Every structure is written in structure tokens, then in C-alpha cells.
Assembly symmetry: C2
Homo-oligomer: 673 residues x 2
């Protein structure tokens, strides 16, 4: 909106800041001169006639510029740059007082017959001290200077202004009395040393002002020498009012200073802790080295500034995230656990991180304690030990900088294996288990890449090789879930996705909970493209599934003759347990199509059943001439005889099927030769 309406000045624009520093000097002078020109001058002498006029001009320009400078809103908190909007702010807030102050009040007083009541309007110019108030308010924002220190300095300036105005009003009250009664004033009876302030209206301006200000200052600290004191009743009343207000002001000054000392104690807290803790060491005669360790911890508490890490919980999530992305991200790259993964996965690890600092000798994680945080040793060294049955601890490989520990336990979801000890000051970056877990679920491919890095990290340290078996349990769980995804894809139709997963490392020979390689599922589904791809990946043509079937079994179940022939070109052969007896059961079913596809795979020509009957026997007795001829084509012999010594020819003759009788008669009579 700053382009929308030009000539508008930004609230913190450079030139406006310079003008602020200029009008601040002019406001200080105007507010420190209005009481002087009011009390000590019953009409400003022409000697300073220029200096007042220019002064008003200095603020007159400021009456105009404040009609163009923008102001930051308190509702939308956004700088509003509209002259229509800008002017109203001045016209309501402070335009009236500044404009009344800008009049040539001294000239008006001299142009109205020297009427004092007109000169009383000069006090309106004291409202220009609001500029100093604004300056102090702005200075309070600066972290350069303490808020309480700014408060006490503001109170000191308040005392400066109050004493200056009080001295000016005191001299004015001295002047209100007629000169002939000047002996009744506080100054007209002053006889300090050998100097009597008899004709006090003719003394030099600075001698009079210094006397009045001496009174004001000595009463500001309530020294009350008594050399200069109120004599009139107006003087008495003003001294009472000034004294009471200054009592309140001095009490506030003491309160501000005392609060600054009490509250504003930073290293004094460490010192207070040291007091009684050194008392502790001394009354218990701790070893000097142990004393040094304790003092090191307390200094560490003020040197690790964990509070500077606790604040981040208050900064919102995203901005904290970018802080992490600029600080912890190098430390994150240094982790060998992550190594080469997607930059997004690494960034998410970066986002959710809780920096911590620990102490030399103190232990961090305990054996048997369920891992709740995933720690990276970034700058430091760390050593774990395991207490045995006898109690002696088991030294493990030390965890030097740019490493990650506790990760394996989190991956296996098992308690912390070894009680880990902080050897010295360590930059222990922390990741909560749950955050890492969600990040892994989103980035599953990166998760498996970590799994590879994990196996390498397992052989890296033999103490983690003590838990390689549990890690392998977890790896097997991952591989089973991955085989689940592969099989689910073979059922859905995600051809390219399952190819990508196999490229990722998915063994198509991996067995699922159903223990059927995805070849079976692609065969039964009919995704002949997926079946062919699995053929290129060297899946065995006839893997036996948990249910004792082949992929080609599932193909023939649905009769996917495309897939059936595809596997036949690979040499499809059921070779099932009792495949010929399963053909006895198939002739029991009577499915000539199922049988045709089976015998095209040609698992077995004929085999005796629990009744010692070949499937040809069953077909011949059943009169199933088509199935029996088709079995003879497969190789089902007619010389075979059942448990009761009956050949399939005998069964066919019993049935009386002319075509089947002729077929089996001719075939068996030929077979005899």
C-alpha cells in the first residue's frame, strides 16, 4: 500500500529516524525551557526572540510530517499507509496539544497588554515531552539495555524535569508577590553568605536559576539544608505539593533500583548456588577433584543454557523447524545411520529434534530401560556398559562424535541394551521415538535404505552384533511386510510399482503369511504381464505354496491359459504330491476343462487312488469318454488295474459306452503288445 499513496514515510524510515533524533533534541529543549521562560521571564526578552520563533518552527514542520508518516496498526499489526487513514491518527491522538503549543504564546502575551493568564498557556508546550516519552518507550524495546535499567533512567529524567519545573514555579511564585513585599518571598529574604538577594528581579538569570534549582535539587534528595526555604503561603503550599510528589517519586526510584537488583540477577544465581554448595563440600570434606566436578556441573547448568533450548518449545513448529534445518542439519548428515537417503527424509529428521547437553561421568541411558529417545552423538564421546549377573559391567565400543546410538534398540522396539555413560561434554541431539517412527512410515524406501545402513552398523560394532539376532527378527518382519506389499500389488495390478519394489530389493521368492510367491497370485489373477516380469526375475515356475500348490496350479484353477502357456514355455510342471491322485480327485470333480489345462501341463498320466484306481479307471467307470480319451492322450494306461484287478477297459465295458468301450478295447489291446 506504500505505492498506492506516495509521500508517505515508513514508521522506521531512515530519514524519519534522523528527523526523530532532531525533534527529540528540540522537544527536550522546549520542555526544559518552557518553565524557565515562564517563571524567570515575565515576557521573553528580544535577545532570545529568534531562538523561540525557530523553536516553534521546528515543531511546526513536525506537525506536518506526522500527517504523512505511517503507523503500525494495533488491530492488524500491519503498517497502514493511507493519508486518509494517517491524518485521523494525528487529529485524534495529539494534534490538539501540539497545535496549541505551536502558537507564538510569548508574542501573544506581549500583544495582549502583558496579561499573565495568557502566559499561563505556555505550559501547553510541556506536552512536547511526549517525544522523550516515545524515545524511552522505543529504547525499552532494544535488548541492548535492560528494561528495568531503562525504567530507572526514565525515573531519573522524570526527577530532572520535575526539579527543573519545580524550581521555575518556585521562582515564579516568588515573582507573583509585588516587589515592595519582596522581603516576604523565599528569595527576596535570602542572605547566603554576604550576598543578600534583595533586588532579586535584577540578578543575573543564571544566578537566580541556580539558586532556585539548588533549592529544588536539595529538596529532591530531601537534604533540606534550610538555607533556602518557603516563606509565603503560596511557597509553603507548593513546597508541600512538591515534597509529597517527590516522596512518591523517590520511593518509586528506590523501588525500581531494588527490583533491578533483586530480579536482575543472572550469574548471581550461580553464585548463590555456589555459596551453599561450597558450604556442603566444606562441611563434608569432598575431594578437590569431586568439588571441581560439582562446580563444573553448576557452571555447566549456566554454560549449557538448556533454557536457550527450552525456549524453542515456545517458538511455533514451522519456525523452530527452520532453526533445526539451519543448525542440526549438518549434524544430521554426519550420522552414519542416515547416510544416503532422500533429502526429504533427512529434512524431516532435522525438523523434529531436541538438542541436549550432558555431563562427564554421568550416565544417560540405562540398561533395561525402554528406549524413548533416539540420540545422536554430534560433538562428544560416549561409552556403554552392561552389568552382568555378578555385577561387573561389560565395556562396549565407544560412541565418538558424528554417530547415532540407541537407534538399534528403537528399530527393534526393545529396551536400551547397555547403560550408556557420558564421558565428556556432548552435543546429544535427540529425536523422539514416535516422530522417527512416523517419518519412517512416510518414507518407507528411505526406511529400507536405513535398514541396509543398519546391517552395516551392526557388523560395525560387535556389541550390537550381540543383538544382531533380534535385529534379524525385525528385518524378517520388514521382509514379510514387504512380501505382503509385493503380493498385494500382484493382486491389485500395480505392475510398475511392484517392479520398482523388486528393484528396491524385494525378492519375489519371499514367502508371505500364505507362503505363496507373487507368481501364484499373478497367475490366478491373470496379470500375464506381471507373471512374465516375475518370470524374468527367475521365480521358480512351480514353487510349492503353504497350501501345497504351484503358481501354475492357481493359473489352471482360473484357467488363465495365457499364463498357463507362459509358464509352459518356462517348462510348467505341477510335480505336486499325488498329482495323479489329484487327477483321480479331478475326475471325481468332472471338470474336463480343468483336466485339459492340467494335462496340458501334464503333471501325471495316471496314478492309483486309495481305491488303487487310476483316473482313467474313474473316468471309464463313470462313462466320461471325453476325460478318458484326454487322459489316454496324456498317457493314462489301460493295462493298469484297480485294487480289484479291473482295468479301465473293464470299467468301460461295465458302463457300456460304445465309443469308450471301443477306445479302451483298441488302446489296451495295442498296449498289450
Amino acid at each position: 500500500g506504500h505505492n498506492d499513496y506516495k509521500y508517505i514515510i515508513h514508521p522506521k524510515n531512515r530519514w524519519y529516524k534522523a528527523w526523530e533524533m532532531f525533534i527529540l533534541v528540540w522537544a527536550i529543549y522546549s520542555s526544559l525551557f518552557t518553565p524557565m521562560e515562564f517563571g524567570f521571564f515575565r515576557g521573553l526578552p528580544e535577545r532570545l526572540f529568534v531562538l523561540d520563533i525557530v523553536g516553534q518552527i521546528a515543531f511546526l514542520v513536525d506537525i506536518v510530517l506526522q500527517f504523512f508518516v505511517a503507523y503500525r496498526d494495533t488491530q492488524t499489526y500491519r503498517t497502514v499507509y493511507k493519508p486518509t487513514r494517517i491524518a485521523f491518527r494525528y487529529l485524534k491522538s495529539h494534534f490538539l496539544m501540539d497545535f496549541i503549543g505551536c502558537f507564538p504564546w510569548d508574542l501573544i502575551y506581549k500583544a495582549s497588554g502583558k496579561h499573565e493568564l495568557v502566559r499561563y498557556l505556555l505550559w501547553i508546550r510541556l506536552f512536547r515531552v511526549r517525544k522523550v516519552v516515545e524515545f524511552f518507550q522505543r529504547l525499552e524495546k532494544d535488548t541492548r539495555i535492560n528494561y528495568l535499567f531503562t525504567r530507572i533512567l526514565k525515573l531519573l529524567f522524570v526527577e530532572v524535569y520535575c526539579t527543573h519545573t519545580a524550581a521555575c514555579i518556585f521562582y515564579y511564585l516568588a515573582t507573583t508577590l509585588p516587589p515592595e513585599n519582596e522581603g516576604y518571598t523565599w528569595i527576596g529574604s535570602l542572605k547566603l553568605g554576604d550576598y543578600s538577594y534583595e533586588n532579586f528581579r535584577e540578578i543575573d538569570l543564571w544566578k537566580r536559576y541556580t539558586t532556585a534549582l539548588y533549592f529544588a535539587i536539595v529538596t529532591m534528595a530531601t537534604v533540606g539544608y534550610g538555607d533556602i526555604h518557603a516563606v509565603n503561603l503560596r511557597e509553603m503550599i507548593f513546597v508541600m505539593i512538591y515534597v509529597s510528589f517527590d516522596m512518591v517519586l523517590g520511593a518509586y526510584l528506590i523501588g525500581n533500583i531494588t527490583a533491578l537488583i533483586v530480579k536482575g540477577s543472572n550469574t548471581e544465581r550461580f553464585r548463590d548456588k555456589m555459596n551453599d554448595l561450597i558450604s556442603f563440600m566444606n562441611r563434608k570434606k569432598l575431594g578437590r577433584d569431586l568439588r571441581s566436578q560439582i562446580t563444573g556441573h553448576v557452571r555447566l547448568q549456566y554454560d549449557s543454557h538448556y533454557t536457550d533450548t527450552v525456549m524453542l518449545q515456545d517458538i511455533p513448529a514451522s519456525i523452530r523447524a527452520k532453526i533445526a534445518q539451519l543448525l542440526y542439519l549438518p549434524y544430521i548428515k554426519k550420522v552414519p545411520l542416515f547416510k544416503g537417503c532422500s533429502t526429504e527424509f533427512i529434512n524431516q529428521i532435522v525438523i523434529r529434534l531436541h538438542e541436549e547437553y550432558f555431563l562427564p561421568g554421568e550416565v544417560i541411558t540405562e540398561q533395561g530401560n525402554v528406549v524413548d529417545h533416539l540420540y545422536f552423538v554430534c560433538e562428544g564421546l560416549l561409552e556403554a556398559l552392561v552389568t552382568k549377573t555378578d555385577g561387573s559391567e561389560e565395556s562396549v565400543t565407544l560412541l565418538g562424535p558424528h554417530t547415532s546410538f540407541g537407534d538399534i534398540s528403537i528399530i527393534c522396539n526393545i529396551s536400551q541394551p547397555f547403560t550408556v555413560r557420558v564421558c565428556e561434554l556432548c552435543h546429544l541431539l535427540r529425536l523422539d521415538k514416535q516422530s522417527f517412527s512416523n517419518i519412517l512410515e512416510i518414507y518407507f524406501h528411505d526406511g529400507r535404505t536405513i535398514l541396509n545402513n543398519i546391517m552395516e552398523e551392526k557388523e560395525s560394532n560387535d556389541r550390537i552384533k550381540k543383538l544382531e539376532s533380534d535385529i534379524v527378527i525385525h528385518i524378517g518382519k520388514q521382509e514379510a511386510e514387504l512380501a505382503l506389499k509385493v503380493n498385494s500389488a500382484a493382486f491389485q495390478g500395480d505392475f510398475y510399482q511392484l517392479k520398482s519394489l523388486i528393484r528396491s530389493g524385494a525378492d519375489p521368492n519371499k514367502t508371505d503369511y500364505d507362503g505363496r510367491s507373487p507368481l501364484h497370485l499373478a497367475a490366478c489373477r491373470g496379470y500375464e504381464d506381471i507373471t512374465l516380469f516375475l518370470i524374468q526375475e527367475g521365480v521358480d515356475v512351480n514353487l510349492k505354496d503353504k497350501f501345497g500348490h504351484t503358481p501354475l496350479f492357481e493359473a489352471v484353477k482360473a484357467g488363465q491359459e495365457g499364463v498357463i502357456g507362459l509358464l509352459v514355455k518356462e517348462g510348467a510342471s505341477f510335480n505336486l504330491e499325488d498329482s495323479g491322485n489329484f487327477l483321480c480327485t479331478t475326475v471325481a470333480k468332472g471338470d474336463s476343462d480343468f483336466l485339459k489345462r492340467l494335462l496340458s501341463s501334464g503333471m501325471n498320466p495316471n496314478s492309483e487312488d486309495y481305491d488303487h484306481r487310476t483316473p482313467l479307471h474313474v473316468a471309464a467307470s463313470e462313462g466320461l469318454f471325453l476325460m478318458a480319451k484326454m487322459l489316454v492322450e496324456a498317457g493314462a494306461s489301460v493295462i493298469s488295474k484297480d485294487r480289484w484287478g479291473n482295468s479301465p477297459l473293464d470299467e468301460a465295458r461295465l458302463c457300456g459306452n460304445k465309443k469308450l468301450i471301443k477306445l479302451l478295447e483298441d488302446v489296451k489291446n495295442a498296449q498289450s503288445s
Copy 2:
């Protein structure tokens, strides 16, 4: 556009849920299964081989998982695509307690 991607993604995701339900009935994570019943697919939803997790619970012997599926009311006679009710795998696996539960 994201809604259209999840038109298929949620279908695949439901498929994963059913497989995970069977997995938890095949690894032994009951508590996860109790949560998943109200925070995932149901046992009635079958997998590629049309096998409800009751078939696995018959094999494994997770009779407490089996009892949760009973509370759901999932058909104890629901066969797999291999045409076999979970009772068969209860008998084959030899889980006499599970056999008793499905007889009950």
C-alpha cells in the same frame, strides 16, 4: 486431484489394512489388533487369497485374537478362496483350544 489419487490410494490402503490385520493375527500383536478393529479394516474384508484372519488365528492359536474376531461377529464358517472354513486349519494345525472355540 489429491482426492482422485486417494480414490485408488485408499483402496490399496484398505488392502494393506486387511493384510496387516492378518499379519497381526500371524505375529501375535493383539493390542494393535484391538486398536485396528476400530482403526482399520475388518476381518470380513479378505485378502488376495480371500482368507480372513480367523484362518490364521486357527493356525497360530491366538485364541484371544480369535475371541476378538468372535466379538466382531465375523463368520466362523467364512471359507477362504481355497474353499476351506477356518475350522479346517484349526484341526490341521492341531490347535485343540482353537478347535474348541470354533466348535463353541
